[PDB]
Design a protein around this ligand. Structure first.
Ligand SMILES: [Mn+2]
Ligand SMILES: [Mn+2]
Ligand SMILES: [Mn+2]
Ligand SMILES: [Mn+2]
Ligand code: NA
Ligand code: NA
Ligand code: NA
Length: 320
DNA sequence: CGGCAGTACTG
DNA sequence: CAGTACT
DNA sequence: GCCG
């Protein structure tokens, strides 16, 4: 990154807008930061700044202040609430609205939350694992977690296919959590497995807490056995084989990669989701779907790229 | 002016 | 529904 | 915040 001296201060504002709930302004900052991190050389003129997609007048002005003066004065006017709002919204299950409510009610520390806040079931689990959920794991540990889920699943049906997606499949050396996708080539055998699979993992002691238990998605907490182990976030999704390619693409990400791909599809009158790539999608002036369109056959990730007119990218090239 | 991805889950 | 979460 |  050629422009650390710029992006480092912009990311402070981005985080401030994000925890205060100004999601679209924060999105603009996030994109401009990526755009700056993707530029070969350091940026040296306001005209070069606008050069970059994702950099407008206001962002170019901010970059110039940074280069001429070495600082951005807006940083000196960030609300004193922001560190606390960040502290609170790092509780799993608490976002900007809950953080702002707790702040308005006078809470300033996790001790205040522990002792005085009403917590949802999810948030109480988030708080108990506050430190652990901010820690990443070595990818070798993600491998052990993936293999634990697969062994429990294959015990029920040898035909079940389990793959760790997210940062793991993109090849990262550390992982924030483990994202396991499960399907069955027979197109049927994936149905109703969650009850038995989660019970199998829970009877081990491996599954320690449940956050979300849906018919297709599980989000929870696990811990491998023995000393020196931390609690880790584990997500599981079970999908029909018909949707494997789009589910794999979704679950491998990155998030910004997915959003970019889905935006591209929309420009082409198509729609991309974890379920399917669809064509002839009908939308209104506001960009919302009014007519469903037709699911396109996508047996492989390659097929999704091809139908969108894009060259295939390995998971490691999706780490946007 | 107004979209900025599309979906699942909780209560 | 609003809120939060997933990539 | 940016951009069509
Ligand atoms: Mn992940
Ligand atoms: Mn995850
Ligand atoms: Mn722990
Ligand atoms: Mn993530
Ligand atoms: Na630009
Ligand atoms: Na949170
Ligand atoms: Na009090």
């Amino acid at each position: 990154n050629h422009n650390l001296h710029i992006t480092e201060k912009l990311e402070v504002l981005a985080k401030a807008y994000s925890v205060q709930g100004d999601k679209w302004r924060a999105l603009g900052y996030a994109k401009a930061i990526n755009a700056l991190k993707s530029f070969h050389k350091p940026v040296t003129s306001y005209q070069e700044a606008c050069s970059i997609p994702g950099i407008g007048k206001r962002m170019a002005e901010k970059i110039i202040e940074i280069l001429e003066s070495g600082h951005l004065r807006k940083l000196d006017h960030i609300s004193e609430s922001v560190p606390v709002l960040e502290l609170f919204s790092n509780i799993w299950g608490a976002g900007t609205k809950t953080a702002q409510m707790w702040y308005q009610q006078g809470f300033r520390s996790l001790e205040d939350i522990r002792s005085q806040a009403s917590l949802t079931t999810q948030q109480a689990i988030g708080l108990k694992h506050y430190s652990d959920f901010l820690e990443r794991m070595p990818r070798e540990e993600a491998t052990e977690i993936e293999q634990t889920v697969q062994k429990a699943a294959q015990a029920f049906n040898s035909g079940l296919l389990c793959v760790a997606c997210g940062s793991y499949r993109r090849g990262k050396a550390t992982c924030g959590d483990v994202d396991v996708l499960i399907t069955h080539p027979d197109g049927r055998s994936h149905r109703g497995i969650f009850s038995r699979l989660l019970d199998s993992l829970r009877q081990e002691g491996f599954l320690t807490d449940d956050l979300v238990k849906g018919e297709t998605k599980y989000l929870g907490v696990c811990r491998l056995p023995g000393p020196g182990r931390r609690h880790r976030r584990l997500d599981i999704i079970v999908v029909p084989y018909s949707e494997f390619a789009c589910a794999l693409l979704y679950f491998t990400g990155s998030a910004h990669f997915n959003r970019s791909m889905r935006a591209l599809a929309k420009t082409k009158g198509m729609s991309l989701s974890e379920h399917a790539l669809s064509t002839a999608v009908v939308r209104n002036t506001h960009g919302a779907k009014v007519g469903p369109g037709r699911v396109l056959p996508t047996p492989t990730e390659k097929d999704v790229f091809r139908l969108l007119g894009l060259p295939y990218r390995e998971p490691a090239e999706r780490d946007w």
